[PDB]
Design a protein around this ligand. Sequence first.
Ligand SMILES: Nc1nc2c(ncn2[C@@H]2O[C@H](COP(=O)(O)OP(=O)(O)OP(=O)(O)O)[C@@H](O)[C@H]2O)c(=O)[nH]1
Ligand SMILES: Nc1nc2c(ncn2[C@@H]2O[C@H](COP(=O)(O)OP(=O)(O)O)[C@@H](O)[C@H]2O)c(=O)[nH]1
Ligand SMILES: Nc1nc2c(ncn2[C@@H]2O[C@H](COP(=O)(O)OP(=O)(O)O)[C@@H](O)[C@H]2O)c(=O)[nH]1
Ligand SMILES: [Mg+2]
Ligand SMILES: [Mg+2]
Lengths: 429, 429, 19, 430, 40, 27
Amino acid sequence: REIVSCQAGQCGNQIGSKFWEVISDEHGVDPTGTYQGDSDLQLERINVYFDESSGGRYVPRAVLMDLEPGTMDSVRAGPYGQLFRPDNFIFGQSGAGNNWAKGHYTEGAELIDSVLDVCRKEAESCDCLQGFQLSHSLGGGTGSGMGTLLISKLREEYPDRIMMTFSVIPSPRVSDTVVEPYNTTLSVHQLVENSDESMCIDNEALYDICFRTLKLTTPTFGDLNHLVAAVMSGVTCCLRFPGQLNSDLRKLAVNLVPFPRLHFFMMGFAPLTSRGSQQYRGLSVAELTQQMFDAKNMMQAADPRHGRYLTASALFRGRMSTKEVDEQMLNVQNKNSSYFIEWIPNNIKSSICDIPPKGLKMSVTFIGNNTCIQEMFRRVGEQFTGMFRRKAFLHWYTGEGMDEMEFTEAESNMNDLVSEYQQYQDATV
Amino acid sequence: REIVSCQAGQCGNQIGSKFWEVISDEHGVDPTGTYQGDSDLQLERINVYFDESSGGRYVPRAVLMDLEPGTMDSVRAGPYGQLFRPDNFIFGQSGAGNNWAKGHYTEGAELIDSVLDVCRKEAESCDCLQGFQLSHSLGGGTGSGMGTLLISKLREEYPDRIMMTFSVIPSPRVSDTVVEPYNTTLSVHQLVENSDESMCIDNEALYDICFRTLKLTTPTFGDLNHLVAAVMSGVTCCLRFPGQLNSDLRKLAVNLVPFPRLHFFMMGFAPLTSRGSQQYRGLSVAELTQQMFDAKNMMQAADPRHGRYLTASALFRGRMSTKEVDEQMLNVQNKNSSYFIEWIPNNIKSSICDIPPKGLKMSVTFIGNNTCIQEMFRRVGEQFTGMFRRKAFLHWYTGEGMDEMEFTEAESNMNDLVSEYQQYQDATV
Amino acid sequence: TLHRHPTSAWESTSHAATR
Amino acid sequence: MREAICIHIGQAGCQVGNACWELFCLEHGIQPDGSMPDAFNTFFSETGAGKHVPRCLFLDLEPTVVDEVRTGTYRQLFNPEQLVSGKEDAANNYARGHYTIGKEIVDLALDRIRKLADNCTGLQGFMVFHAVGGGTGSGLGALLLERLSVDYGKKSKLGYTVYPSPQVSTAVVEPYNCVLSTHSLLEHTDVATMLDNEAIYDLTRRSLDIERPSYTNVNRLIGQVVSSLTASLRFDGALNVDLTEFQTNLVPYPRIHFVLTSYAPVVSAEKAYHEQLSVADITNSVFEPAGMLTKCDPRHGKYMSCCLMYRGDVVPKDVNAAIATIKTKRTIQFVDWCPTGFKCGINYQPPTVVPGGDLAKVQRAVCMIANSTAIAEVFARIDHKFDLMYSKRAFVHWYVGEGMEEGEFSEAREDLAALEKDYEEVGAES
Amino acid sequence: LCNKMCVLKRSLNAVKGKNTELLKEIDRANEENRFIQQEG
Amino acid sequence: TGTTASYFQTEQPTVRELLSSWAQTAS
Ligand SMILES: Nc1nc2c(ncn2[C@@H]2O[C@H](COP(=O)(O)OP(=O)(O)OP(=O)(O)O)[C@@H](O)[C@H]2O)c(=O)[nH]1
Ligand SMILES: Nc1nc2c(ncn2[C@@H]2O[C@H](COP(=O)(O)OP(=O)(O)O)[C@@H](O)[C@H]2O)c(=O)[nH]1
Ligand SMILES: Nc1nc2c(ncn2[C@@H]2O[C@H](COP(=O)(O)OP(=O)(O)O)[C@@H](O)[C@H]2O)c(=O)[nH]1
Ligand SMILES: [Mg+2]
Ligand SMILES: [Mg+2]
């Protein structure tokens, strides 16, 4: 009934910090740790993301993870940085160098045991932990390597728990480092197995939404992280608040995963209103539907029109009409047929929660196991093939104790995954 | 229910000084000797440690005992020095010079007669003694030799009384002398036969506590001695205060000494949280349990994971539900049954007092007969034999009046003492 | 802020029960 | 006397029970305090202080809805026990609601069942409310019904089940859950009542002329129809029929006991009371396909048996006139081997409207429960829903890993095949 | 390349959807046939 | 200092005060 959060890398640290920002805003948690909300149901499920202390304060069930203590100082100095425990603020001395080898085998190995110890302590504090929630970036070394190493080492003894692993996959046009393909290739295959559920981030669609959907003049990493933290909260909104038709992480997993390897998802948030069109738009499920599946309003950098929707779900927040929601989803299913797989009719799931986000009458979080994700995976597999044909940058990885065979196995596993996506999207009845 | 204390050597004098000034603070005793407490449970059993005088002053029932007079001068110059009984300051003129025999055979033997005289004088004034407490260090010269001489001498006149020995035993990384091996190997067997059970303190575990557990950039010996005195005072909590489920030193001995020779213990205390982590930590016995059993929260430089616990006890202080504390001890038992010994059920022990230390709503003192003392004794015996093979530094003892045969016998004494622990830890039913 | 449990509140659980 | 134990399984079951107990309390004049400022003994029991407590039991493996009921508007009305909540939900997983999660709460569920039944003296039966499409409502409901039938002989069970609707559905494994729970709904439920959602949706959209009802209003209507059917043993009337007396009428063959229900006049005040509300017109609206509580069109199938709950000031002459008109009408053609096909009960207690509801208070109400050949359409579409699911091993690992045999789903498919086979067999002309 | 890819798949989705309303009215006409047969 | 170099320590107490006191919410 409670979720323990983990943050890996500096990108993961920032996104977890703003996720805690929005969670504290929703639950009325003072930066000082006290409760300042004006509702009774708000305290009903306060234990989901918070633990009570002796002084009547609430502390997040968050583990913070990195190899640079500088980003620890940054998140601590953040507006809500005085909320987390100091012992969870675990960090290394020297970084991974944005190298998966040091992040997963040498620099991360000496500290993964400590993070497992603190995670186990938080879990045993929890009366019944029903899942972990890690936020990280696959492009980096610290966020990707030891990030996914955490799931790999916890899953070996946490069989029935759930993984909300959210990973920022890099892009060619947001190519920040040359070893992004190696970092992503060495981690996607491991996220396939160790994590029951995995969820994707790419800066292309986030930038596109910030540019056209919100027309923000200068949307920085703050708005970037806030846009996806809005969904990081909406995934468990139904668990944290009462609703007409409830759902949780296990609900989404069981109703969105048709096959065990098909657990790479894509989110989407609504409503998104531009800086100067809040009043003119009339907030309703009618136009909520048309932006549910809108590519420009989609925050996953792969056009859903080029793929197939295996399964999809929408977690609505706010007082809504249950026939309107179901009838709009039926309109979606009876208006699109060749993007919803025929052999699984009525792919869309709808869940309803009573409490909307602050400042919104009604909202919704989209989740989908669309097959457009194989384009994301091939657009990085091509780069990996190109940089791996010449054995470029392999010396950095091999100096830390691995071999070329591991890279070949990772490449083969991702190629198998994209082949599975293709053969599950081109299938006929 | 009476215990009379003795401090031996410089280490013993400092640690007993700090223990006395913390126990007097607990009992509301003025450094000048008067009473400033506000509670009656203190005066109910104040006689266990403090002898009342005709003038209404409570003088500690302590024997300060050291060949060096500088330690006596320092303890008298201390804030609580005037509290101590003046004629209990038995001291020599020349220091022991870091030597076994210079404190145990030639110079200590002449001095020890007055110590026995004053000790039995204090003993007779008591209605009946629970026993004798000693605080010393096998690392030091006079702390080890002359203290062990007193250990041997008390047995022949007080055979059936508890002998609570708190030794401070070293490690090479913080080894301040080159005669640690001799001074501990010649001392271990006196504790073996002539003490009902000895509870040991390591120097390096204390520094590990201050650095990692409590995050102190400037802990000194004064900082360390209060942490040791926490256990020094919590061992007798049930003696000095009423208990919901009380106990005593004989209770601990009979419950933690299954076989006569297995009576060397490692110490643990709780709570130990840094002031920064004190805010975000909720002070409850639930978390105090993993503080009990945590590796870095231990008072011995032997990692519990390597060894296996034979019998352990817990002295809880405060107002806690015995219900929940007992189920927690059961929970740790069946969560790690492998760490504990199978053929003794309920290896952990519960004891519940009411009075906690000053300012602490809840406190814990942990006692453990873990087999990991094997590592420490084996390694210090290796250090001994390294120089014992070369007949080096041995000229001091030979000239001072000591033979080779007792050296060989003491080495054999550690050999067959430490040989027990692995063959009890690997045993199968 | 720092909170210190006073000796005034010190009492046995038996005394608390008979209270 | 003449008491029945109400059971509310799952999220949908708990909300339906909330609505129906709200209606029962407002109808019997019991405030949420639990005391009135002996017709209630069927559903409420006195204590030593003169307080009434419902004879109901809430189950759900997740605690959100149960705790919402606990902290709702009936803290002092609902017992702190018989409000059982698990700690983690089944999450639309029949395997988990039946095998690995519900097994640790079923024992306490039967303990509470015993603690209610022993207090009861003339227990008529059990009134289960749930939705087979949900994980707990399928697995835990099935297991509870099996245990109840084992330990209570042949006691009557009335299970109101919210079936997965034809196309308006809120989950993807609803066909799996329904096809699996159809077993328990066959062997260990005496009567199973349809609760298709689109029927309520359409009738509230059209007859009520209201654009924004929701689960609250559908559950209110379900509670209204439940009260209408069960009020015969609650209040004195011209024709007193109890659970056994109408279940023996509605079950001609042991296997064909699934019934579809309708209620009329379900209507708002403005269009309700500008027309003369007779008995013939309300019966016509009852038999009209779009005024029915189940998403089926009877004009394809064939009515085998019908039971009518008239409740109000209806008079037997009007009852017989309506019966004659229905018999003479040709489109509602009954089965050949059941000539009468009509059972009727009459109550003198007019319906009571609850504050904040959408129904207008009506002088006379009519419930209809029918066992028909037309109920085979729901199964003949659910099997096509499910064979597409099962063709390529979709959502099968989530059950296999939690303890399902692979061939059990095929056995369930064969069972439902036998269901439509026996439906068409009994509907076939002689 | 997604000049053409994007425009063609938008066209495909539109043609798709309008075909699916054609399927809607196909079901409507099938229902009309079945109940007119029942009524006749 | 509150920085990570000092392991988030506002002040450095001796074990005497550290065990004689316990910190709670300052609000
Ligand atoms: N008539 C009616 N149906 C409902 C209501 N709430 C939910 N349902 C439907 O019942 C179906 C099954 O219920 P679930 O939402 O799965 O809840 P559950 O029965 O407790 O099962 P779990 O969610 O696994 O715990 C859902 O798909 C809904 O469509 C309600 O209040 N009234
Ligand atoms: N959404 C988001 N992405 C970020 C943020 N900070 C960094 N990134 C992305 O993370 C990538 C670099 O990750 P990196 O810092 O090397 O990860 P690390 O090595 O684990 O610290 C860049 O491509 C950024 O686009 C942030 O605050 N929000
Ligand atoms: N706790 C504590 N231990 C001390 C102190 N001073 C010395 N020691 C320990 O005593 C050992 C050396 O003993 P020593 O000073 O020679 O004792 P002496 O020969 O009896 O005077 C070292 O290994 C230290 O661990 C102190 O102030 N506090
Ligand atoms: Mg006792
Ligand atoms: Mg539910």
